[PDB]
Ligand binder design. Structure first.
Ligand SMILES: *[C@@H]1O[C@H](CO)[C@@H](O)[C@H](O)[C@H]1NC(C)=O
Ligand SMILES: *[C@@H]1O[C@H](CO)[C@@H](O)[C@H](O)[C@H]1NC(C)=O
Ligand SMILES: *[C@@H]1O[C@H](CO)[C@@H](O)[C@H](O)[C@H]1NC(C)=O
Ligand SMILES: *[C@@H]1O[C@H](CO)[C@@H](O)[C@H](O)[C@H]1NC(C)=O
Lengths: 169, 161, 53, 110, 127, 53, 169, 169, 127, 110, 127, 110
C-alpha cells in the first residue's frame, strides 16, 4: 500500500456523496460533515489521465491474409496461424499486466492523496491538537463551526489558539 | 490415419510391378500403391480413366505417382511410346502431369524416380484420373482420425514421465 | 546483379569470386546480359546475401 | 507550446463534393484532446467533433474527423450551402490550449 | 436545456478594467467549470483561461497572467471574467464555454467546450 | 501505355479429350508462351476426363 | 525507496527468525524480542500474490512450422526465422522488464509495511514517548513486560501512563 | 505522488546550483544556503541506474526478407508486411508505456528522497523545534552557523539544546 | 504424519450453540491455519470460514457472519468451530481442513485443503 | 461470487474407459486456485488435484487435471471400480471459496 | 589536461602502515571520485576500493574491509589510500584512477577509470 | 561475485593480422559496465574500450569491442608492433569490481 487508506482509517463514509475525501467534526454545536474539493479533484484528475491514455485504438490498418471461404495452402496457412497466435499471446500478456499494474497504482495514489491531506491538517494545527490514531485530531481549545471551516480551507491560524491549547496539553 | 480401399479394377494391362528397393519377400513395392504396366514387355497402354468419390464426412487424402524412367527406351518398354499424360480433376483441384525420362544418380542402386503428388478430396466430392501410362495408382485413400501433435527428436521415449 | 555473380554477365566479371562482410545491391544492378530470369530468384538472393562471398 | 497549423487557408468547392481539412500539430497529441469547430461570420463557434473522431450532439453525419499523432483531419463528405464557414481545430491536452489559424470553406457556380 | 448567456457589449478606455458575466442554466454548477476564449476582429480564436466552479482552481495563459481574474457564482451559478490595464489589443469578442467534468471521473472529451455563450464585444478605445 | 500497372489475364482450355482438342484447334502440341520485362513463362494444355462441374 | 527500511533503521535482526517484522524492548526486567505476526503476513500475502500471478504457463499450443531434418525452402524459412527471433526479442524484453519492475515493488512494499507498523506504534504511544531516530521509542514511564506486550498487540492505553510520562517530558 | 515535493514545499530554489536538495537557514548572522550531497547523489544514482538500463540495443541481427528493388510475390509479401506492422505496434506500445511508467517513478522517487531527508531532520531535532508547515523548522534555541552545520551533517545533539528549547515551547 | 481428528457427533435443539473441535498432529501449528467446510445430508460441500493459527485473522462467508466464531489452540494446537442460533438448516457434516501456508512465502497450492478431518455430524432438531 | 458449475450431473462408464469431468467458472480464475476432490458415501473428501493440474501425494496418475481461465477438466484416463464416487471442483482465489455442485461417476455390466 | 600524479615508491616493514597520495589536476574535484587498483608483481590487476569526493561515501572489497581507509583532499583536490597491518601479500603496485560522474546525471561509462596515475610500488618486507 | 575469465592465455600473431580476445562473465552484465585495458610491462593500464563497444579518446579504430550478456570480445583488426602487451577486461556493474586474468598478445618473424 502506501500510508493507509484501509489502515488507521478503519472505514469510509457511505454518507459522503459530496466528494472523495472530507472532514467530519464534532463540537458543542452538533455534528458536521463536509467534503474536500481540491484533494478529491487531484485524485479524479490522475485517474482520468490514466483512462484517457489507456482507452485508445490504433490508426494502423490490418488486412486479410488468409481465407475463410477457400483455404490458403497449408504451409503458408500454418505460418500465419502460428504468427497470429503469437501476437495474441503478447497482447493478452500486455493487457492483463497493464490493467493489473494500473489498478495497483490507482489504489495506491488514492491512498497517497488521503495521507497527503491528513498530514497537511496535522501540520496545520501545530501543537494545538493531538493525533487520535484513527485519522482524527483531538482539539484542545473547543473549536466552533467557524474554527472548523478555517481548518477546512487551510486558513486556521495555530498561534491564535496556541495558549489555551498548550495549557490543556 | 485410417485407410479405405478405393476399388480400382483394371483391364488390358498388368498391375504388379516391383523392385529390389522395396524388399519384403523378395522384390515388392508400396503397400498402398500399384505399379501399372503394360501387358507384354512392350506394346501400348490404352488411355484409361478411373474415378473415386469421397463418400465420407471428412476430406480424403488422395495420393498418386508419376514414374520417371531411366531413359525413353525403358518407358516405351513399360508403357509404350508417344507422350504420356496424367490429368487429375476435382472440384477444388485441377492439374496435370508429364513424365521425364533421363539418367539420375543411383539411389538404392536405381536411377529412375517417382514423383508423389497429392490432393485432398472434399466430402461428396469426386476425383478422376485420366492416364495412359507412367502411372502409380493409389490402392487406398486415407482419412484423418482426429488431432495430434508431431515432434522431431533424437532422444528416447519415456512413458513414465 | 547479385545473381549475376553466379552466371557471370560482363558487369559481374569483377565479382565472380568476391568476398564480403557487407554486400550492397544497387538499383542499376542486373543479373542478366542475355534476356532471361531466375526461377526462385529471391531465395537465391537471400542465400548469396548471407554467403560472405 | 503546441502549435496547430491548418491547411489549406481557403478551400473552394461546389455543393455536394467532398471537402478535406487538415490540422497538423507540432507535438504528438492524444486523440481525445482534439476538437473541431465551425464558425460563421458573427456567431459563436459550434463544436463539431470532440476527441478527434466523435460527433457532437445533433451534428450531421457528413462531418467526420479522423487521424492520430500529429495529423488530424475533418472531412465534409458532401458539402451543403450552409457549410460555408470557417473551421478551427483545437488542442487541450497541455496548456496553453491552442487553436489552429483556421480554414475557410467556400462554394461555387454563377 | 444548457445555455450560456453573457452580459451586453462594452466600451472601455485604455488602462481601464472590464467585467464580462456568464449566466448558467441547464446543468448543475461546479460539475464542469468554464473556459474563456477571445476573438479579435477578423482574427481567429485564442484561449484565455479556465476556472473550476468545483475547486476554484484557475489556469491562465502566460499573456494574461497578472491582469486577468476568473471567478464564479456568489451562489447563482454564474462565472465572471475580469480584465484590467486594457490595451488596444484587448479589443475582441469574449466567449465563455462550459468545460471539463469536475467532481466525477469520466472518459473522453464530451464535456470539453460543449456549450458556448453568444459572445461579448469589448471595444478598448479612447475616442 | 498508362501510368499504373495493367492486370493482364488469359486462359488455357483443357479439353475433355485429345479428340475434342483436335476438333477445336487441331492436332500436334499446342504451346502458349507469354513474355514481358518482369514476366517470362509458358503453358501447355492437358486433355483428359474430369468430374462434371 | 519509500520511508526507509534501509534508512533510519540501520540494520535488520538476523536473530529474528520468528517473523519478518518485530519489536525489541529494553527495561528493568531484561532484554526482549518478539515478532509481529500480522504485518509480516501482510507482506507475505502480497509477495505470494505476485509469485502465483507470475508463475504461470500458456494453455496455447504451438506447433512445428519448419524442419530440423529436411530444411524448408529458403524464402519461407527466412520469414519464419525472422518472425520467431522477433517474438524472442519481445518476450526477452517483457521478461527482464517484468522481473525488474516486480523486484522494485517487492522491496518498496516491504519498506511500506515496516513504515506502517512503525508509525502505528508512534500513534499508539501518543505523548508518552519520543522518537529516538533509529526506529526506537524512548518511553517516559518505565514500561514493564506486560506494558510492552500491550504495545505489541495494539491495546496500550496511552492515557493510563500519560501523567507520569508528560511530567518526565 | 508521494509525500509532496510539489506540495507543502511550495517551490524549488533556482539559486541552488550546488545540488538537488539542500538547506536554507536564517539566524542572527545572516542568510545561508547549502546543498545536501548524499541525498542528491541517492537520486542521481537511481536515475542513472534507469537510464543505463533503458539505453541499450539488441545484439540480435535481423536480415532482409523482402525486396525494395524487385518486389516479392504478393501473398508472401502481405504476410511479411502484416507481421512487421504487428511487431511495430507491439514496440510502439512497449516504448510509450515504458517511458510513461519510468517518468512516473522518476518523479515519485525524487519526491521520496526529499521526504526522506525532511523527516530525517525532523527526528534529528527531537523536541527542540516545531514543524513550520512549508518544509521549515522553527528552532527554539537560536541556532548559530556551527549549530546549523551540525544539523546539515547529521551530528546535532538534541539534548544539548533541549532545556532552552522546551522552555521556549 | 499429519492427521486431523475432530470431536464426536452432536445433537442440539434449535436456537442453541454447538462447538466442534479439531485436534492437530504431524505438522507445526500456526504454519497453516484451518478451513472449515460443511455438508448437508444428500447435498454438496460449502465453505464456512477460515482462521489463521499464525495471526488469528478470520474470514467468514456472508451466511455465517455474526453467529460463527473460529478460534485456535489454547496452546495444544487445536482449532474450534463455534456456531450459535442453530437453525434446522445447520444440520450438516462439519469438516475441518488444514489450509494455506502462513509465516512463509511459498508458490502454488500444495498446502490448500491438503488434509481433512473425519467429520462431525451436527443434528439440529427438537425431537 | 464465483459460481462453479459442473457437468455432467451423472457420468456412467464401463471400467477401463476414459472419463472426462468439466468444471466451468463464471469468472476467470487463475489455475493455481483450483482443486478437485473425490468423495465416497460417508467419508471425508480426499484432494485429488491442486492448482488445476498438480497431482496430490499418493494420487494415481490416472487422475489428471487441465484447463485454464473459465474451463477446467478432471480426466480419469482409465476407470477402476473404486473410482465410483462423487467429484467436486473448488475455487479459492477470491472469498467466498466456492464448490461445484459435483459430478457422480458410475460403472457398468451385469 | 587531466592527470593523476601519485607519490613516490615506498618500503615498509610487515605490520606497519602505508599512505599513498594522488594529486588531481585538469578536472574539477568532487565531480567524479576515485577508484583504487593494486597489482602484485607478475600478477594481474585487482580492485581495492572507491571513494566519492562529492559525498565521501566509500566502498571497499571484502579483503580490505577494516584495514583500508580512503580519504580526499583537505582542500587541495587530492585523494589518499591508507593501508595498515601490511602483510607480505600487500606487496604490489597501487594505482589510483579517476572514476564515475558524481553531482550530475550522465549516460554511459565515459568517466569510468578514464585516467590513471603512474603508479606507486609498495614493498612490504623486513630485510 | 562476478568472475571474468579471459581466453586465450596467450595469443601469438604476425603483424597486420586480426586478433580476437574473449572475456566471458559468470553472470549477465549490462554492456555499459564493461571496459577493456591495455598494459605494457612497467606502465599504468590505458583504457581502450568502455561500455563494451565505445572507443576511448585517441584510441586507434583498430581496437573494437563487441558482445553482450556473458560474452564480450576485444578485436584488434590489424596488429601493429606496439600492440604487443597484456589485455584485461573489467566489470563494474556490481561490487566488487572484478578483472579478467588477462590475455597476452605477441607478434612474429625472425
Ligand atoms: C488456423 O486457425 C483457423 C481458426 O482461427 C482455422 O480455421 C484454420 O483451419 C487454421 N489453419 C489451418 C491451416 O488449419
Ligand atoms: C452428401 O451427399 C448426400 C447424398 O445426396 C447428402 O444426403 C448429404 O447431405 C451430402 N452432404 C454434404 C455435406 O454435401
Ligand atoms: C533458422 O535458424 C535455425 C536455428 O534456429 C537454423 O538452423 C536455420 O538454418 C535458419 N534458417 C535458414 C533458412 O538458414
Ligand atoms: C509493404 O509495405 C511496403 C512499405 O513498407 C510497401 O512498399 C509494399 O508495397 C507493401 N507490400 C505490398 C505487397 O504491397
Amino acid at each position: 500500500l502506501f500510508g493507509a487508506i484501509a489502515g488507521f482509517i478503519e472505514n469510509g463514509w457511505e454518507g459522503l456523496i459530496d466528494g472523495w475525501y472530507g472532514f467530519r467534526h464534532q463540537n458543542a454545536q452538533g455534528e458536521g460533515t463536509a467534503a474536500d474539493y481540491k484533494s478529491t479533484q487531484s485524485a479524479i484528475d490522475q485517474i482520468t489521465g490514466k483512462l484517457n491514455r489507456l482507452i485508445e485504438k490504433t490508426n494502423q490498418q490490418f488486412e486479410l491474409i488468409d481465407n475463410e471461404f477457400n483455404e490458403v495452402e497449408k504451409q503458408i496457412g500454418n505460418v500465419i496461424n502460428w504468427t497470429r497466435d503469437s501476437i495474441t499471446e503478447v497482447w493478452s500478456y500486455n493487457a492483463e499486466l497493464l490493467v493489473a499494474m494500473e489498478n495497483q497504482h490507482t489504489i495506491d495514489l488514492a491512498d497517497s492523496e488521503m495521507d497527503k491531506l491528513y498530514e497537511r491538517v496535522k501540520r496545520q494545527l501545530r501543537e494545538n491538537a493531538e493525533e487520535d490514531g484513527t485519522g482524527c485530531f483531538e482539539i484542545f481549545h473547543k473549536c466552533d463551526d467557524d474554527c472548523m471551516a478555517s481548518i477546512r480551507n487551510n486558513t486556521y491560524d495555530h498561534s491564535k489558539y496556541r495558549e489555551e491549547a498548550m495549557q490543556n496539553r | 490415419i485410417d485407410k479405405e480401399a478405393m476399388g480400382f479394377t483394371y483391364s488390358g494391362i498388368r498391375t504388379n510391378g516391383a523392385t529390389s528397393a522395396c524388399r519384403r519377400s523378395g522384390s515388392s513395392f508400396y503397400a498402398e500403391m500399384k505399379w501399372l504396366l503394360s501387358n507384354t514387355d512392350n506394346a501400348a497402354f490404352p488411355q484409361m480413366t478411373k474415378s473415386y468419390k469421397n463418400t465420407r464426412k471428412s476430406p480424403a487424402l488422395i495420393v498418386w505417382g508419376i514414374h520417371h524412367s531411366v531413359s525413353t527406351a525403358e518407358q516405351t518398354k513399360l508403357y509404350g511410346s508417344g507422350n504420356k499424360l496424367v490429368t487429375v480433376g476435382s472440384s477444388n483441384y485441377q492439374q496435370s502431369f508429364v513424365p521425364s525420362p533421363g539418367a539420375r544418380p543411383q539411389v538404392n542402386g536405381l536411377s529412375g524416380r517417382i514423383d508423389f503428388h497429392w490432393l485432398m478430396l472434399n466430402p461428396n466430392d469426386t476425383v478422376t484420373f485420366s492416364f495412359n501410362g507412367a502411372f502409380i495408382a493409389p490402392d487406398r485413400a486415407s482419412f484423418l482420425r482426429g488431432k495430434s501433435m508431431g515432434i522431431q527428436s533424437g532422444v528416447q521415449v519415456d512413458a513414465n514421465c | 546483379g547479385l545473381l549475376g555473380t553466379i552466371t557471370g554477365p560482363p558487369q559481374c566479371d569483377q565479382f565472380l569470386e568476391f568476398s564480403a562482410d557487407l554486400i550492397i545491391e544497387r538499383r542499376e544492378g542486373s543479373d542478366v546480359c542475355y534476356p532471361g530470369k531466375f526461377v526462385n530468384e529471391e531465395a537465391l538472393r537471400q542465400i548469396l546475401r548471407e554467403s560472405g562471398g | 507550446e503546441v502549435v496547430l497549423t491548418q491547411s489549406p487557408g481557403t478551400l473552394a468547392l461546389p455543393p455536394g463534393e467532398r471537402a478535406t481539412l487538415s490540422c497538423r500539430a507540432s507535438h504528438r497529441v492524444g486523440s481525445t484532446y482534439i476538437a473541431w469547430y465551425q464558425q460563421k461570420s458573427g456567431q459563436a463557434p459550434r463544436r463539431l467533433i470532440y476527441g478527434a473522431s466523435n460527433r457532437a450532439t445533433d451534428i450531421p453525419d457528413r462531418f467526420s474527423g479522423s487521424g492520430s499523432g500529429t495529423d488530424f483531419t475533418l472531412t465534409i463528405r458532401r458539402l451543403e450551402p450552409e457549410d460555408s464557414a470557417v473551421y478551427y481545430c483545437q488542442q487541450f491536452s497541455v496548456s496553453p490550449w491552442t487553436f489552429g489559424q483556421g480554414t475557410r470553406v467556400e462554394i461555387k457556380r454563377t | 436545456q444548457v445555455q450560456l448567456v453573457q452580459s451586453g457589449a462594452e466600451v472601455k478606455k485604455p488602462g481601464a478594467s472590464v467585467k464580462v458575466s456568464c449566466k448558467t442554466s441547464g446543468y448543475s454548477f461546479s460539475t464542469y467549470g468554464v473556459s474563456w476564449v477571445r476573438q479579435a476582429p477578423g482574427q481567429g480564436p485564442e484561449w484565455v483561461g479556465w476556472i473550476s466552479a468545483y475547486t476554484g482552481i484557475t489556469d491562465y495563459a502566460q499573456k494574461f497572467q497578472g491582469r486577468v481574474t476568473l471567478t464564479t457564482d456568489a451562489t447563482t451559478a454564474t462565472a465572471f471574467l475580469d480584465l484590467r490595464s486594457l490595451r488596444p489589443d484587448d479589443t475582441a469578442t469574449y466567449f465563455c464555454a462550459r468545460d471539463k467534468v469536475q467532481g466525477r471521473v469520466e472518459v473522453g472529451s464530451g464535456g470539453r467546450h460543449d456549450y458556448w455563450g453568444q459572445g461579448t464585444l469589448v471595444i478598448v478605445s479612447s475616442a
